[PDB]
Design an enzyme around this catalytic site. Structure first.
Site, short mmCIF file in Angstrom:
data_model
loop_
_atom_site.label_atom_id
_atom_site.label_comp_id
_atom_site.label_asym_id
_atom_site.label_seq_id
_atom_site.Cartn_x
_atom_site.Cartn_y
_atom_site.Cartn_z
N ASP A 252 -1.16 -10.21 -9.01
CA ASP A 252 -1.32 -8.86 -9.57
C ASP A 252 -1.38 -7.86 -8.19
O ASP A 252 -1.82 -8.21 -7.42
CB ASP A 252 -2.47 -8.95 -10.33
CG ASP A 252 -2.33 -7.54 -11.33
OD1 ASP A 252 -1.61 -7.67 -12.24
OD2 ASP A 252 -3.12 -6.65 -11.37
N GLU B 274 -2.69 -3.78 -7.89
CA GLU B 274 -3.05 -2.38 -8.37
C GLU B 274 -2.23 -1.30 -7.51
O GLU B 274 -2.45 -1.50 -6.16
CB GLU B 274 -4.52 -2.39 -8.25
CG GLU B 274 -5.51 -3.55 -8.93
CD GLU B 274 -5.28 -3.49 -10.35
OE1 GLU B 274 -6.19 -3.60 -11.15
OE2 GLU B 274 -4.13 -3.31 -10.85
N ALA B 275 -1.85 -0.41 -8.16
CA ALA B 275 -1.05 0.57 -7.44
C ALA B 275 -1.20 1.89 -8.10
O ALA B 275 -2.35 1.89 -8.82
CB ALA B 275 0.49 0.26 -7.90
N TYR C 266 7.73 -4.37 -12.99
CA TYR C 266 6.79 -3.93 -12.24
C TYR C 266 6.43 -4.46 -10.85
O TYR C 266 6.89 -4.28 -9.73
CB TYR C 266 5.67 -3.43 -13.00
CG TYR C 266 4.70 -2.39 -12.33
CD1 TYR C 266 4.90 -1.02 -12.37
CD2 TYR C 266 3.78 -2.66 -11.67
CE1 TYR C 266 4.40 -0.19 -11.71
CE2 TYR C 266 2.89 -1.91 -10.77
CZ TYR C 266 3.30 -0.43 -10.91
OH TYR C 266 2.57 0.40 -10.22
N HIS D 178 -7.96 -2.42 -12.59
CA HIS D 178 -9.25 -3.15 -12.92
C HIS D 178 -9.86 -3.90 -11.72
O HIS D 178 -11.00 -3.78 -11.63
CB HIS D 178 -8.96 -4.06 -14.23
CG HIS D 178 -8.12 -3.31 -15.35
ND1 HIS D 178 -6.92 -3.27 -15.17
CD2 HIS D 178 -8.86 -3.00 -16.43
CE1 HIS D 178 -6.60 -2.60 -16.50
NE2 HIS D 178 -7.53 -2.35 -17.24
N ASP E 23 -7.73 -9.21 -12.56
CA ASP E 23 -6.42 -9.63 -13.31
C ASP E 23 -5.81 -10.99 -13.13
O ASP E 23 -5.44 -11.52 -13.93
CB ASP E 23 -5.50 -8.54 -13.23
CG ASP E 23 -6.32 -7.08 -13.62
OD1 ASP E 23 -6.89 -7.09 -14.53
OD2 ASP E 23 -5.55 -5.99 -13.20
#
EC number: 3.1.11.2
Lengths: 214, 211
Positions: B12, B14-15, B120, B171, B176
Site C-alpha cells: 500500500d 500513502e500519497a 493507482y 490511514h 492498510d
C-alpha cells in the site's frame, strides 16, 4: 560541559532479534525487526495515550538459521526451521546485509541502535552475524542498551519488557516486531532521560564484540 | 505453463492526492508472504484468523516534492512538515536499493498485490521507479484485489470489506496492508486462483506520469 566522545545521534533504530537459544549455543538470528525513528519524534512524543511516532521506518526479516533451534526458543518465538524453510527464507546472507544497509542509509545519521539488553545479547549477536560476512554499519553508529540505562536512571531517582510496560502503562503488551513495538513505547515514556543517557553514554558500535566467530 | 507466483508481496501507498494532481508517495509498506502461508491460513487458539508467523515487512516514509492535498494529509496523518522534520528524503536510490534487496529476499516469481493497484498503486509505484531507471524482477506479476473481489462477487473500500468479513477493524501504509492481508486470507483460495489465472505482468504496467 561534559560531552562524551560519542557522536550525537540523529536517528534511533530500535531493534530486536528472535534467535535459536542462549549464547552457549552460538545462536542465530531467525528474525529481526528495526524501527527507525528520527530524534525529532523522540523529543516530541505523540498522543490522550502515548502512540508510536507517525513517521517511522520499519524492517522485519526472517531467515532460516544454519543450526537447530532449542525447543524453548521455537516455543517462545513461534519459529522453527521447518517453518522458515517451508517459506524459503535463506539464512543471514548478502541479501540480508544489503537490505539492512540500504535501510540504514535512509536514515539521517549518525544512528544510535537501541536494544534491550543489547550489550549482552542483541548487539554481539548482530555483530557476529555481520562479521561472518564482513559487513559494516555506518561509521559513527552508537549503541544504547535500555536495560543498564533504565536501571541507572532509576538508581539515580523488575526490568523485563513485560514489567517495564505494565509499570509504565498499567498493563498488557502485544515477535521481533512486537518486542520492538513495546520497547519503543517504554522509551517514549522516559524519552527525555533516555536521549540524554544515549548522548552521554552510547557505546561506539566499533567497540561491540561479536558474540562468537564463524 | 509458466511457474506461478511463489511469494505474494502485499503493498500500500500513502500519497499526496488523486492521479490528476500527479501524487507522490509519502509512505510505502510491503508485506512479503510465501505462497504456502496463503494456501494454509493460520488460526488463533480461539480459531480466529491471524497473519502468517513468517513475514517480511518494509515500511518507508518519504517527503514528496510537491504539496499534500488537504484531504490526503487528513486521512493519512502525514504532512510535508512532518516528513521534512524527520529528514526523510524523497523517493531516491536509497529507496530503490532498499526495495530491491528486500525483494531479493523473496522466493520468486513475485506477485505484487494492492487494493486498487491497477488504477493507482502500480502505476504510481512504476512512475517513481521509472524516474530512476529502476526495475523489478521481470517475472513479477500483479494482482489488484478490487476487480478481483468485485469479480468473484459478480461497498469495496478496505474498510467496508473488513467490516463485512470479520466485523470491526483495526490511514497508515502498514495499517492498510495489514487489513488487506487479513481480507486476502479470508478468501485465499478464490484469490490465489484468480491470481494464477489473471495476474498481469509488471512490465505491462505504465507510469502514471513522467516528472
Amino acid at each position: 560541559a561534559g560531552m562524551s566522545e560519542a557522536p550525537r545521534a540523529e536517528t534511533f533504530v530500535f531493534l530486536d532479534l528472535e534467535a535459536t537459544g542462549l549464547p552457549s549455543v552460538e545462536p542465530e538470528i531467525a528474525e529481526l525487526s528495526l524501527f527507525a525513528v528520527h530524534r525529532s519524534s523522540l523529543e516530541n512524543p505523540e498522543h490522550g495515550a502515548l502512540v508510536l511516532p507517525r513517521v517511522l521506518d520499519k524492517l522485519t526479516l526472517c531467515m532460516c538459521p544454519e543450526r537447530p533451534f532449542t525447543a524453548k526458543a521455537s516455543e517462545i518465538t513461534g519459529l522453527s526451521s521447518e517453518g522458515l524453510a517451508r517459506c524459503r527464507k535463506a539464512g543471514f546472507d548478502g541479501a540480508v546485509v544489503r537490505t539492512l544497509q540500504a535501510f540504514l542509509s535512509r536514515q539521517a545519521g549518525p544512528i544510535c541502535l537501541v536494544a534491550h539488553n543489547g550489550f549482552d545479547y542483541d548487539f554481539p549477536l548482530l555483530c557476529a552475524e555481520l562479521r561472518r560476512l564482513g559487513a559494516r554499519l555506518p561509521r559513527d553508529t552508537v549503541c544504547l542498551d535500555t536495560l543498564p540505562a533504565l536501571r541507572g536512571l532509576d538508581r539515580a531517582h523488575g526490568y523485563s519488557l513485560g514489567s517495564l510496560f505494565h509499570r509504565y502503562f498499567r498493563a498488557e503488551p502485544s515477535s521481533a516486531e512486537g518486542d520492538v513495538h513495546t520497547l519503543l513505547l517504554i522509551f517514549l515514556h522516559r524519552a527525555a532521560e533516555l536521549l540524554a543517557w544515549a548522548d552521554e553514554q552510547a557505546r561506539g558500535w566499533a567497540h561491540i564484540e561479536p558474540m562468537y566467530l564463524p
